[PDB]
Design an enzyme around this catalytic site. Structure first.
Site, PDB file in Angstrom:
ATOM      1  N   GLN A   7      -6.732   1.722   0.387  1.00  0.00           N
ATOM      2  CA  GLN A   7      -5.364   1.986  -0.427  1.00  0.00           C
ATOM      3  C   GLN A   7      -5.210   3.439  -0.146  1.00  0.00           C
ATOM      4  O   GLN A   7      -6.026   4.343  -0.494  1.00  0.00           O
ATOM      5  CB  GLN A   7      -5.613   1.786  -1.781  1.00  0.00           C
ATOM      6  N   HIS A  28      -0.275  -3.279 -11.386  1.00  0.00           N
ATOM      7  CA  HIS A  28      -1.109  -2.714 -12.510  1.00  0.00           C
ATOM      8  C   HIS A  28      -1.014  -3.545 -13.853  1.00  0.00           C
ATOM      9  O   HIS A  28       0.144  -3.953 -14.154  1.00  0.00           O
ATOM     10  CB  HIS A  28      -0.709  -1.303 -12.849  1.00  0.00           C
ATOM     11  N   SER A  88       0.640  -0.638  -4.097  1.00  0.00           N
ATOM     12  CA  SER A  88      -0.916  -1.118  -4.529  1.00  0.00           C
ATOM     13  C   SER A  88      -1.147  -0.536  -5.810  1.00  0.00           C
ATOM     14  O   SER A  88      -1.922   0.109  -6.348  1.00  0.00           O
ATOM     15  CB  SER A  88      -1.823   0.208  -3.627  1.00  0.00           C
ATOM     16  N   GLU A 125     -11.037  -1.727  -5.198  1.00  0.00           N
ATOM     17  CA  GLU A 125     -10.199  -1.116  -4.349  1.00  0.00           C
ATOM     18  C   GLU A 125     -10.435   0.534  -4.361  1.00  0.00           C
ATOM     19  O   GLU A 125     -10.282   1.080  -3.340  1.00  0.00           O
ATOM     20  CB  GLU A 125      -8.526  -1.478  -4.794  1.00  0.00           C
ATOM     21  N   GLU A 178      -4.654  -5.205 -10.888  1.00  0.00           N
ATOM     22  CA  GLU A 178      -5.387  -4.021 -11.273  1.00  0.00           C
ATOM     23  C   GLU A 178      -5.506  -3.547 -12.486  1.00  0.00           C
ATOM     24  O   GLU A 178      -4.312  -3.285 -13.081  1.00  0.00           O
ATOM     25  CB  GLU A 178      -5.344  -2.741 -10.331  1.00  0.00           C
ATOM     26  N   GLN A 236       0.825  -5.635  -4.872  1.00  0.00           N
ATOM     27  CA  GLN A 236      -0.244  -5.662  -6.056  1.00  0.00           C
ATOM     28  C   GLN A 236       0.262  -4.601  -6.969  1.00  0.00           C
ATOM     29  O   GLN A 236       1.147  -3.806  -7.165  1.00  0.00           O
ATOM     30  CB  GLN A 236      -1.220  -4.579  -5.424  1.00  0.00           C
ATOM     31  N   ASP A 254       2.238   3.380  -6.352  1.00  0.00           N
ATOM     32  CA  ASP A 254       1.582   3.019  -7.478  1.00  0.00           C
ATOM     33  C   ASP A 254       1.721   4.130  -8.581  1.00  0.00           C
ATOM     34  O   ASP A 254       1.030   4.038  -9.654  1.00  0.00           O
ATOM     35  CB  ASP A 254       0.017   2.389  -7.150  1.00  0.00           C
TER      36      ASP A 254
HETATM   37  K   LIG Z   1      -4.131   0.146  -6.726  1.00  0.00           K
END
Ligand SMILES: [K+]
Ligand code: B12
Ligand code: B12
Ligand SMILES: [K+]
Lengths: 138, 555, 184, 555, 138, 184
Positions: free
Chosen positions: D297, D144, D363, D222, D171, D142, D336
């Site tokens: 997460q 950003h 994440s 999330e 995200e 995942q 992350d």
């Molecule tokens: K995240």
């Protein structure tokens, strides 16, 4: 006579059984005897017996190859450092002729009584001949 | 211009300076699983292996023969070889299978069988397995102590510092071959000044090194190389027999030693016989096993530039460490050579061994800034010390190194510098000036060291060797100059030759010159609740890094 | 002018005592023409020869065919040299100043990080070699080291050595290299 | 000034800028195993847990009660709790013990029990266990997608690139709340330009996010947070009940969602109740399990600066990921957020999850340079992309990302830029000139993006939200501007709500919008010879790095 | 009537069994219809039956907690989004009085027939009461 | 002169439609005195006001005691301001421009990285606010982000927040704080 895993380390558990090849006990290798000159470089060496014990400890650890290494090395103790170096070098690629390697094996077996090393070198002679590592030109 | 700034930035990334290449199996430029590698196999006829990895005895090269006749348990190989590679792979990570049961199997398999087992494992599995296969319970560390100028004063100081930092072994080498005796000498003195019991080696030409060891100028040898092909062995100027005899020579003097191999050597040297790096390394591992050598320094080692170049190279490096370990050999698992310009990348390469732990996580952590590393740079160097200590604290992983203060370092370095100074003065060697002693005291590297008269040192080394100086002469020289303790320390390093205790697998020395090896400090991992677990004392040392502020006192 | 190698006959084992034999790799200035850092073999040979001649000795260049390993190449050059001092260099740049009597893997001076070698360093390699030939003790050429050379060049070094090694002729005797001065 | 230059250099290393502190359990400033943490225990009286980790039901706070009545299998807890923590720990690494067998036990233990199990494990064991406990067979990733200016054009572009690089989830968030709708909108368009099926979320205040979801401007949520103490939960503006209801609200709309927690939030928010970060996190994990939320997460996440500050913090982060995984939850394992100035340090922190693999290794890998990362920077960012692909190639580890050529990236970024342009035009929103499209096309960060009339944007959004714009309106816009293919992709993302397939544990979508979750892509690890192994095609992709030179062409 | 793990994913294995809560088949949610306007936002949603199907697949994977969440979520489908948001907020700390939560539970149970959610909210009322999370002074 | 705060008495909601309430944390300019970057609370609490007035509004200062959370601080502040707008700020520095009617964890503007806030910022946070308090749509204070702030300050921010949180008084009402310009 025979060592066991719990006798290791030998220096701590069985010091008495540790002797220099020159016959001196471990307790003789001190700053004192070194400064006085009683103990010289030729004394700070390992003896056949010791290697035998270390071999025994090794094999009882399932490290037979190591034990065999130690026992074979035990035969080299009495051979002069210069000769050990020369034999090693004679073993390096293309240094020796088959005859030279066999002659060395003869010396090892009959002069030094290093029977295993003689067989070892005899083996190297054959191997070198078959794999062409003998000095170029028979 | 019509160009992505994103990629422009990426293009300037240090890692893109790394030498990466596509695989070229014909030239052995492939980490593992080469289509040209042999299929594992073995056949015992009348107590003699007459078939090894698809090769009949009359097809054997020197390596096949040595391996067949010395490296494999003939009486069990046929049965062991009946196990599937993946089954052995499972045993390696299976908490119900002891390292002893695995060893009883691996010491009975072939070079090809070993790599096929590795082929079934991902890096997590290998680390899981490595932590169980490691011979010694407590992992240790080895560092490099060198400098551009082969400066004896700097060497002694760095050795002393590296010693208090925790390294159990220290290795030096030379820019100028003729300097070897001085490097060895300085290393020995310095090592015993930092932490009594620290083992030292001087990596140079084989015969030269054996001589240094016979003269008690070193306490062990490591770079006693073996190679995976006859041709490379030949350019290495040895055969499995000359090297086996050599190992024997070392033992015959009560001198600890291990072999050095590592993926990539045969390719870099031009004769890979179209085999993968791991298969050839596997052969080296078995040559090591067969010679009766207790340990091996592998994990690409100096040729990490080769293995790291190709796919799965870093995984192959962990694999070669695992193969060496599962074969019940002590493993000084590299992480001692540069291969990347990226901190990200070099860190991943080292964590492979550091996380699970090996006999020597680093077989050459550079105890000096890399510009001074005469092995052309280590994967980690003196400037990573703080990072390395924080990692241990972050992960609760014993990395084999502890934090040290500037005060105790300056003190230990000063003492080492004075010790070597006094040893040179006593032995009538070229003078080591107070300016040098002081410079070595606060130096980072040779950039702070005043230049020495090189020709003068070289002539002096030749005269020294001619004078047949031995470790006992160093002892006496230390004794007469007020360094009774270092003299005694060195004497105790030499006394190791008489007891033979440190000849056993993974053997290192504690501060009292007592041996700590796989024999009396066996790794007995069987999963959570077993094996090595950091002591409360050691864990405290790891987390109590200087500078860490007590939170309740902050404003 | 450009230094250009021209193969002659079998290299003799002792032409004069006041000489320094330069043993170049199997592919040097023939199948390969530059080092890892694209430095023409001619100019490097020119610096070596000059360095030696600059010291009053004769630079005799030969091609080693029986090996691509620089240690043995220099060793062979040393045993071919009437002064006992030799210089060995591979196509990638790696160079060694050897001396008969020394073990093959030992040496007087080594230059194990070719990429760091400059034409100037080569000039000093020839000078020191000649100095050794005159049985003197020249200050060794200051060793150089860059921790990123291997990361940057090792794989390339292997590729270069792979090629050079392709021209190794098992047991082949050394070959005299006439030094032709050709227009740039 | 006689200081050691060795130390002067060390004192200057980036890592020394990291905020490290001694433990202060009283304030929860301790990663795990706090002396104040409760001893594991449970007691069932008439189908009701009346005792939980040393607390009588009459002593239960909201969290204890929620966990007791929702997060623990009451019928098996008493028996499962009779297992030693070290025993469960062995099971986690025991290849003969299935993932399912472990889950039947873990879903029956308590928060204190879970951390006690973790206490028995080193990082290698935890990674070994994590690769087995991971729900989905194939780990994913995942990222950003943000920028200091909340620039729609850049977001769309960044999302497209992030899409081809391989991220399954993207995200975004805002520096300015009001921009949220455009960010979600832009992310939505860009994601479907890069890779059809990419999931997208816009992390803002809870009610605000759900509304964005109900309006079809996102495909999942999330950062639906839960905390370990009542007081922190309160400052978080929720209770286990409002959050569980919130989770259901998402599901009632067919919207995929997971909770977010992570070690350190309670201590950073001032109410740790003197408990360790991990214990508190364990409560959060159980709250998540009890709510019936499919994933979590965690792994310090945004509060990585808290966990990484204390001893074994990074090991604790791995541990919290493992607890969530063994509890059979989908795990987006953080990595992350920035916590270190050191590349060596941040790398070790990430390999913990990357090596074994999690449902989402990161994440929130920053798909934009960290100066644009509106989550205050990620542990890895756009500039680390090349290193990351090289790591995968090095370790033969699937990191969930692939190499991309500059050409295809520029193309994908322009299209996304044009699409987000065609959309703003079709919805009568503040124009997006070709000076922005072209800029965002070749940009790295918001530094290459022409400024935009912010106010005029915050007005178009407020008015766009009044016009009740929904995902379908976006679909229409893309359809009327020739972007049929993309109009369709978004519709297929919204159609996920109708089938409910991507509501299952670890669910993501392939290019055909078909769900790949733990249900149809079950991780089935049982040691070597099983579980996820990189496919020949995926392996080839990992190796195929642009710039890797074919060895036979080097002159 | 009942789904099986082998029936997942539903979109691919049992498309026909998937209907929007508005009474439209999955095959109706197309670009064509969204453009035409016959398919709107209220259609691109999940139905009670679908959540029930996912709950079944989840519990057959031993994820009972998730199955329970899906079934509770099913009850919320018909409640307007604004009311869903409203109830969520009313559940946030200090927003509601015990009576207001109970009245919400009444609405849920008798107006929406969301019996499980009603029980859920009645539970929050008590917990909030005991843990002081109700609106101060209610 | 140095801006110093003086503990008045329980504050009350609404007091002129043209007032932008300033809600300082429970320890601001009282138990704590500087931000994470050791910026004095007085100078800060001095810029926030000048920004206000420069736009033509009256700034009123109060001390939130019921909570230590900044969003909840600016909210209680927003619900004590006849303009509806309110500013919240913690001792470590974190600041938020809120507005009643908005959810507690939402806001008009956020300054989530204290260590990066200068005085010109704690100034613009006055102008923009006032612009809001007067129903305008000022261009929000350009948000700033530094990826290393957390690595450097997060741990510290927790420490400062712990100190601030120690002075939270459950349910306690806001306490107006008078402004005293103490002679340098
Ligand atoms: K995240
Ligand atoms: C990689 C390496 C190896 C590899 C590769 C060898 C090869 N022939 O390909 C391996 C492990 C196999 C090796 C072996 C040896 N090495 Co080595 N090696 C290095 C190292 C770490 C890096 C060099 C490098 O990567 N350069 C970058 C590339 C791009 O430059 P290159 O010019 O193309 O590099 C080549 C040379 O360095 C050459 N080379 C490597 N070692 C040696 C040793 C000698 C004596 C010579 C002439 C050449 C040579 O191999 C490189 C690849 O072709 C250096 C350290 C240093 N300071 O340079 C030690 C170093 C050069 N090696 C050394 C020694 C002593 C040896 C051995 C003799 C050890 C032994 N136990 O026998 C053997 C000899 C094998 C042989 N025929 O060369 C010493 C030399 C000391 C001296 N003469 O002053 C060094 C300085 C330190 C050390 N102990 O490792 N080595
Ligand atoms: C760490 C962090 C968290 C942590 C710590 C919270 C805390 N109170 O300690 C956790 C995960 C718990 C958190 C939660 C929330 N966060 Co937050 N958080 C961050 C992050 C990544 C870094 C901030 C930082 O470490 N600065 C460095 C230190 C030294 O400075 P500091 O001033 O002391 O930093 C503090 C503030 O940033 C504060 N804070 C953190 N989040 C929020 C949110 C709001 C609305 C406010 C007023 C303050 C605030 O906590 C920090 C530590 O005290 C930022 C990213 C960014 N761009 O700054 C997002 C960010 C600020 N958070 C955000 C949001 C929306 C939230 C939540 C409302 C999410 C939710 N689902 O409820 C919750 C609210 C909890 C609360 N009462 O604050 C948004 C704000 C968007 C906006 N308003 O424009 C951001 C930009 C991005 C994001 N989606 O995560 N957060
Ligand atoms: K080494």
């Amino acid at each position: 006579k025979t060592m066991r895993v719990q006798d290791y380390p030998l220096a701590t558990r069985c010091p008495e059984h540790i002797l220099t090849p020159t016959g001196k006990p471990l307790t003789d290798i001190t700053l004192e005897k070194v400064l006085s000159g009683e103990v010289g470089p030729q004394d700070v060496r390992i003896s056949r017996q010791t290697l035998e014990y270390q071999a025994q400890i090794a094999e009882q650890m399932q490290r037979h190859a190591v034990a065999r290494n130690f026992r074979r090395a035990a035969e080299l103790i009495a051979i002069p450092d210069e000769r050990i170096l020369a034999i090693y070098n004679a073993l390096r690629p293309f240094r020796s002729s088959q005859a030279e390697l066999l002659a060395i094996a003869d010396e090892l077996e009959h002069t030094w009584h290093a029977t295993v090393n003689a067989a070892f070198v005899r083996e190297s002679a054959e191997v070198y001949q078959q794999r062409h590592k003998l000095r170029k030109g028979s | 211009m019509k160009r992505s700034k994103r990629f422009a930035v990426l293009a300037q990334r240090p890692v893109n300076q790394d030498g990466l290449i596509g695989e070229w199996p014909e030239e052995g430029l492939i980490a593992m699983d080469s289509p040209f590698d042999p299929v594992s196999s073995v056949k015992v006829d009348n107590g003699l292996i007459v078939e090894l990895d698809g090769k009949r005895r009359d097809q054997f090269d020197m390596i096949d023969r040595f391996i067949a006749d010395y490296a494999i348990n003939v009486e069990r190989t046929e049965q062991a070889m009946r196990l599937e590679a993946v089954e052995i792979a499972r045993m390696l990570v299976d908490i119900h299978v002891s390292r002893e049961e695995i060893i009883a199997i691996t010491t009975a398999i072939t070079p090809a069988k070993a790599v096929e087992v590795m082929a079934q494992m991902n890096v997590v599995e290998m680390m899981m397995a490595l932590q169980k296969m490691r011979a010694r319970r407590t992992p240790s560390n080895q560092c490099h102590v060198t400098n551009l100028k082969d400066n004896p004063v700097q060497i002694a100081a760095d050795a002393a510092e590296a010693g208090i930092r925790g390294f159990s072994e220290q290795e030096t080498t030379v820019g100028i071959a003729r300097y070897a005796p001085f490097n060895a000498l300085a290393l020995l003195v310095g090592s015993q000044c930092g932490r009594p019991g620290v083992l030292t080696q001087c990596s140079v030409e084989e015969a030269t090194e054996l001589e240094l060891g016979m003269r008690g100028l070193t306490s062990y040898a490591e770079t006693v190389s073996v190679y995976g092909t006859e041709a490379v062995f030949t350019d290495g100027d040895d055969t499995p027999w000359s090297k086996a005899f050599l190992a024997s020579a070392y033992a015959s003097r009560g001198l600890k030693m291990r072999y050095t191999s590592g993926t990539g050597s045969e390719a870099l040297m031009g004769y890979s016989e179209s085999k993968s790096m791991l298969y050839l390394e596997s052969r080296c591992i078995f040559i090591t096993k067969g010679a009766g050598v207790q340990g091996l320094q592998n994990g690409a080692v100096s040729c990490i530039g080769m293995t790291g170049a190709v796919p799965s190279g870093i995984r192959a490096v962990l694999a070669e460490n695992l193969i060496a370990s599962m074969l019940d050999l002590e493993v000084a698992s590299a992480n001692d050579q540069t291969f990347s310009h990226s901190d990200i990348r070099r860190t991943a390469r080292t964590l492979m061994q550091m996380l699970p732990g090996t006999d020597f996580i680093f077989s050459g952590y550079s105890a000096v800034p890399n510009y001074d590393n005469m092995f052309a740079g280590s994967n980690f160097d003196a400037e990573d010390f703080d990072d390395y200590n924080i990692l241990q604290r972050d992960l609760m992983v014993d990395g084999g190194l502890r934090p040290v203060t500037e005060a105790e370092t300056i003190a230990i370095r000063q003492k080492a510098a004075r010790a070597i100074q006094a040893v040179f003065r006593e032995l009538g060697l070229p003078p080591i000036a107070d300016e040098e002693v002081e410079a070595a005291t606060y130096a980072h590297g040779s950039n702070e060291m005043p230049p020495r008269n090189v020709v003068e040192d070289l002539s002096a080394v030749e005269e020294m060797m001619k004078r047949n100086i031995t470790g006992l002469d160093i002892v006496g020289a230390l004794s007469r100059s007020g360094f009774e303790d270092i003299a005694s320390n060195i004497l105790n390093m030499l006394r190791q030759r008489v007891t033979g205790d440190y000849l056993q697998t993974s053997a290192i020395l504690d501060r009292q010159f007592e041996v700590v090896s796989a024999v009396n400090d066996i790794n007995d991992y069987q999963g959570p609740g077993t094996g090595y677990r950091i002591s409360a004392e050691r864990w405290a040392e790891i987390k109590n890094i200087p500078g860490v502020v007590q939170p309740d006192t902050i404003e | 002018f450009t230094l250009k190698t021209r193969e002659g006959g079998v290299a003799s084992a002792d032409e004069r005592a006041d000489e320094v034999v330069i043993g170049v790799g199997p592919a040097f200035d023939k199948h390969q023409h530059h080092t890892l850092i694209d430095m023409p073999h001619g100019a490097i040979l020119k610096e070596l020869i000059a360095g030696v001649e600059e010291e009053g000795l004769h630079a005799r260049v030969v091609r080693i065919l029986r090996t691509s390993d620089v240690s043995f190449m220099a060793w062979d050059a040393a045993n071919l040299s009437g002064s006992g001092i030799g210089i060995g260099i591979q196509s990638k740049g790696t160079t060694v100043i050897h001396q008969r009597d020394l073990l093959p893997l030992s040496n007087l001076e080594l230059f194990s990080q070719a990429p760091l070698l400059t034409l100037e360093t080569y000039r000093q390699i020839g000078k020191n070699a000649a100095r050794y030939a005159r049985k003197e003790s020249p200050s060794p050429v200051p060793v150089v080291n860059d921790q990123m050379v291997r990361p940057k060049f090792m794989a390339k070094a292997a590729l270069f050595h792979i090629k050079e090694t392709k021209h190794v002729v098992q047991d082949a005797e050394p070959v005299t290299l006439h030094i032709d001065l050709v227009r740039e």
